[PDB]
Amino acid sequence: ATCAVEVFGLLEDEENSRIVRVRVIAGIGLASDPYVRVTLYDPMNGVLTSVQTKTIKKSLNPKWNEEILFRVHPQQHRLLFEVFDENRLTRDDFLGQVDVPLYPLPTENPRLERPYTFKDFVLHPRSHKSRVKGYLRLKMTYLP
Numbered sequence: 268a269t270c271a272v273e274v275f276g277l278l279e280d281e282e283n284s285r286i287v288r289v290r291v292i293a294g295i296g297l298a299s300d301p302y303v304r305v306t307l308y309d310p311m312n313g314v315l316t317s318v319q320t321k322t323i324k325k326s327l328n329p330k331w332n333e334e335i336l337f338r339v340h341p342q343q344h345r346l347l348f349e350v351f352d353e354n355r356l357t358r359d360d361f362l363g364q365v366d367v368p369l370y371p372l373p374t375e376n377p378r379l380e381r382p383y384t385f386k387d388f389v390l391h392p393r394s395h396k397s398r399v400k401g402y403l404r405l406k407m408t409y410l411p
């Protein structure tokens with residue numbers, strides 16, 4: 268409200284911490300009201316936090332175009348993206364996951380405008396039962 272942009276994850280800056288800007292741009296050819304839960308974790312200690320995007324109603328190609336900032340230990344922490352279909356009266360159906368490291372990533376240049384670029388990541392099953400299709404379009408960069 269007085270905060271336009273929150274930083275999640277580590278609650279203070281240390282020598283070994285950076286802020287990563289995660290753009291959750293779109294889902295492409297998903298298997299329908301999708302959102303993405305973005306979980307920040309450490310292999311040794313498990314989940315630090317998670318943030319959920321808005322839900323896009325009735326779409327197999329949702330354009331969330333949403334940014335989330337996390338304060339992280341870039342060489343230690345990882346991100347798990349899980350896409351779900353929000354169901355009002357039952358369990359939300361799983362539409363796939365992507366799991367990525369947080370180093371190396373480009374650092375933003377404060378003097379220049381952030382260019383639009385992206386990478387597509389194939390969505391993966393979470394069990395033999397998952398029926399998953401398509402890609403998650405993302406961009407991750409460090410703040411100066």
Ligand SMILES: [Ca+2]
Nearest residue numbers: 300352353354
């Ligand atoms: Ca639904």
Ligand SMILES: [Ca+2]
Nearest residue numbers: 354357358359
């Ligand atoms: Ca539900």
